[PDB]
Amino acid sequence: XXXXXXXXXXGXXXXXXXXXXXXXXXXXXXXXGX
Numbered sequence: 001x002x003x004x005x006x007x008x009x010x011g012x013x014x015x016x017x018x019x020x021x022x023x024x025x026x027x028x029x030x031x032x033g034x
Contacts, residue, residue, distance in 0.1 A: 007013030010028060017025045 003013045012034065
C-alpha cells in the first residue's frame with residue numbers, strides 16, 4: 001500500500017504504473033486482484 005492507497009485503487013501513482021508496459025501492469029493488477 002502507501003502512495004495514497006495505490007493511487008486510490010489504480011488511479012495513477014506508483015511511478016506512473018512503473019512506466020507502463022509489463023502486460024499493462026499485469027492486466028491492471030489482476031483486474032484489481034493483486
